[PDB]
């Protein structure tokens, strides 16, 4: 079929501060985790357009408007953290508590990102792949946050929320919708 895209509700966007969560990957393969713009289209591959920033754990590469190799690929049962710091326009990916680096040795996966309307965490599961997404309600339920991210200054996502964050998944059932007037290929005209 296609690939399912997972995210949090559009209320939970961030505009400032420094944030963090965690993500266990049970059976490796085609999965994708990172951060996305709120107006994210569910048709596109996650990271192919300018609305997502997302690491790929199959072959160890980052996805944004294309690809560039980044860090080690996966095992079965390793924790892939993600963290963002809006005060400096940075995105950092940590693997197993250890910080991933580029080919140039730099840890910051993306710099000079415009803040804009904000960001919110996003996952992506290919066929067969199983993995749970610890968004960070209970701080002790996290594992590698104390190793890296804690004394840096990053707070988790659901740090003070007595209810869990509602999640929005992309369906597979096609439904009808009116044609947008700014469509690049199709256009109508009521004469």
């Amino acid at each position: 079929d296609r690939v399912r895209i997972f995210r949090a509700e559009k209320s939970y966007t961030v505009q400032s501060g420094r944030w963090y969560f965690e993500f266990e990957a049970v059976t490796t393969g085609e999965m994708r985790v990172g951060w996305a713009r709120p107006e994210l289209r569910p048709d596109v591959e996650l990271g192919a357009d300018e609305l997502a920033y997302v690491f790929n754990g199959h072959r160890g590469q980052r996805w944004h408007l294309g690809s560039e190799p980044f860090g080690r690929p996966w095992q079965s049962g390793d924790v892939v953290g993600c963290m963002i710091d809006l005060t400096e326009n940075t995105i950092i990916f940590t693997l197993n508590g250890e910080v991933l680096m580029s080919d140039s040795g730099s840890e910051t996966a993306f710099r000079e990102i415009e803040i804009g309307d904000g960001f919110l965490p996003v996952c992506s599961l290919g066929p067969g792949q199983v993995g749970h997404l610890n968004l960070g309600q209970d701080v002790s339920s996290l594992r590698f946050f104390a190793i890296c991210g804690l004394q840096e200054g990053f707070e988790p996502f659901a740090i003070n929320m007595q209810r869990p964050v509602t999640t929005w998944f992309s369906k597979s059932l096609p439904q009808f919708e009116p044609v947008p007037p700014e469509h690049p290929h199709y256009e109508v005209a009521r004469m």
């Binding site: 009808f176 919708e177 009116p178 044609v179 199709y186 109508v188 009521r190």
Partner: protein
Amino acid sequence: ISHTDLVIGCLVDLATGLMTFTANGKESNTFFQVEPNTKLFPAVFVLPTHQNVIQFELGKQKNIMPLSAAMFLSERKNPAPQCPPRLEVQM
């Protein structure tokens, strides 16, 4: 390569649920009949091969009322064809 326009019109009889289809004013062999309490959307499926492809034409024939009277309860008695902006083309 046809230099002419194949115009297909359809006919739906509400009190019987009988549906027929006319091809350039010549009736086709097919027909359709449905359950009493059911609804239907008008539909066109197309793979386009031109700069200009199709045109939805909301017209009436010689003795039957157009689709405007069918879908707006305030205008069931009017046979003048209308297209208010609530009607549009989905995809």
